[PDB]
Amino acid sequence: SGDEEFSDMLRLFDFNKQAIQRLKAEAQMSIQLINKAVNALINDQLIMKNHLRDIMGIPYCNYSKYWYLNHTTTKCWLVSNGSYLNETHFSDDIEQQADNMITEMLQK
Amino acid sequence: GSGDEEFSDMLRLFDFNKQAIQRLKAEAQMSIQLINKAVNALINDQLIMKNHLRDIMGIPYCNYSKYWYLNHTTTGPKCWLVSNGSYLNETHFSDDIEQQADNMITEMLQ
Amino acid sequence: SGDEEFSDMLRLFDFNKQAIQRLKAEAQMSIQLINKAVNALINDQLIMKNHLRDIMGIPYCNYSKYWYLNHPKCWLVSNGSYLNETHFSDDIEQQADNMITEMLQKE
Numbered sequence: 557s558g559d560e561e562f563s564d565m566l567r568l569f570d571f572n573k574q575a576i577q578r579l580k581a582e583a584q585m586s587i588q589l590i591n592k593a594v595n596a597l598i599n600d601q602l603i604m605k606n607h608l609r610d611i612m613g614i615p616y617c618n619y620s621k622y623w624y625l626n627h628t629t630t631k632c633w634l635v636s637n638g639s640y641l642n643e644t645h646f647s648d649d650i651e652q653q654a655d656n657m658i659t660e661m662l663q664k
Numbered sequence: 665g666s667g668d669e670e671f672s673d674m675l676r677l678f679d680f681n682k683q684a685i686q687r688l689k690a691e692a693q694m695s696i697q698l699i700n701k702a703v704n705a706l707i708n709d710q711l712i713m714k715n716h717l718r719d720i721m722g723i724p725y726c727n728y729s730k731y732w733y734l735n736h737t738t739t740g741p742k743c744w745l746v747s748n749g750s751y752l753n754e755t756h757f758s759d760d761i762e763q764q765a766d767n768m769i770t771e772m773l774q
Numbered sequence: 775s776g777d778e779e780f781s782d783m784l785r786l787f788d789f790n791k792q793a794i795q796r797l798k799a800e801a802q803m804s805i806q807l808i809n810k811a812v813n814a815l816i817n818d819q820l821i822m823k824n825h826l827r828d829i830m831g832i833p834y835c836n837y838s839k840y841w842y843l844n845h846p847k848c849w850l851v852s853n854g855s856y857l858n859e860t861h862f863s864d865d866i867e868q869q870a871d872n873m874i875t876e877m878l879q880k881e
């Protein structure tokens with residue numbers, strides 16, 4: 557393609573790429589705030605469960621819980637030590653893949 | 665619609681951004697569903713707690729007016745906001761416009 | 775760039791822009807529902823902490839909690855644990871409008 561056509565399409569491309577990256581970063585920030593808040597809720601709730609005599613008899617759900625869980629998606633405690641949320645990190649691989657892609661287009 | 669070699673280039677750049685959008689959609693939906701699982705587990709256990717803890721078994725659950733109490737509370741209670749109907753549904757992002765792209769380029773190509 | 779070539783690349787552009795906007799709105803909706811749910815949990819848990827006599831000896835964590843994070847029993851959820859409204863930005867969209875505006879003013 558002509559170089560001016562390629563420059564224009566490349567500019568529109570860059571624009572949408574930057575918008576995607578912006579949304580990616582903003583969503584990741586808000587999700588991390590939610591993760592911190594939820595993990596704090598879990599911490600305090602576990603302390604409460606460990607110190608409240610009226611609920612000291614209630615066990616933590618065993619593995620079958622995941623299908624007990626499947627009523628709403630498809631007793632006992634669902635929140636446990638292993639309920640904390642990991643860090644959410646969106647991938648950036650496709651960006652460098654684009655860079656390499658149009659680099660080879662500009663060298664071929 | 666334009667020259668075929670030009671259109672192939674713009675269509676390749678288009679593919680790249682479409683694939684990036686799909687990737688972001690899938691990753692965000694995954695993390696949001698994990699959060700939904702965690703929040704629903706919190707709701708379940710908190711309701712058990714509220715139903716068995718004698719010091720708080722007198723507190724009623726908030727009725728429908730809560731939502732405007734809630735709106736005022738966002739700017740600035742005697743009852744529970746989390747109830748049986750506080751669980752989060754599964755979040756599913758839409759994909760219709762993706763094949764709308766297919767339809768678009770299909771009409772463009774002849 | 776000939777006007778018909780620019781129209782084709784511009785239509786493909788519009789499509790991906792619209793898809794980004796759709797995803798932005800849906801993600802913001804789901805995130806806000808999560809925020810409402812978490813804030814309701816926080817509110818009720820604070821009520822609970824205020825009315826459960828057996829656990830009132832437990833303090834709320836002081837500022838050192840943030841380094842507790844980098845790894846002591848105290849409360850992490852407090853009055854200032856609520857989640858703000860999530861609002862994704864649109865600054866770059868009108869910049870696109872201006873971008874193609876100057877491109878079409880050279881036509």
Ligand SMILES: *[C@@H]1O[C@H](CO)[C@@H](O)[C@H](O)[C@H]1NC(C)=O
Nearest residue numbers: 637638639640641642643698
């Ligand atoms: C959290 O991440 C660790 C390591 O990154 C992994 O071993 C663990 O299984 C993850 N937990 C969940 C619930 O995804």
Ligand SMILES: *[C@@H]1O[C@H](CO)[C@@H](O)[C@H](O)[C@H]1NC(C)=O
Nearest residue numbers: 748749750751752753754807
């Ligand atoms: C979940 O979705 C169903 C149908 O879409 C609806 O009837 C129900 O009220 C929803 N629940 C919540 C908590 O939004």
Ligand SMILES: *[C@@H]1O[C@H](CO)[C@@H](O)[C@H](O)[C@H]1NC(C)=O
Nearest residue numbers: 589853854855856857858859
């Ligand atoms: C929410 O944002 C406002 C300003 O936008 C800020 O004053 C407040 O501290 C924030 N809430 C937090 C950080 O919990």
Ligand SMILES: [Cl-]
Nearest residue numbers: 569572681790
């Ligand atoms: Cl694009």
Ligand SMILES: [Cl-]
Nearest residue numbers: 601710713819
């Ligand atoms: Cl709780």
Ligand code: NA
Nearest residue numbers: 677678786787
């Ligand atoms: Na394009």
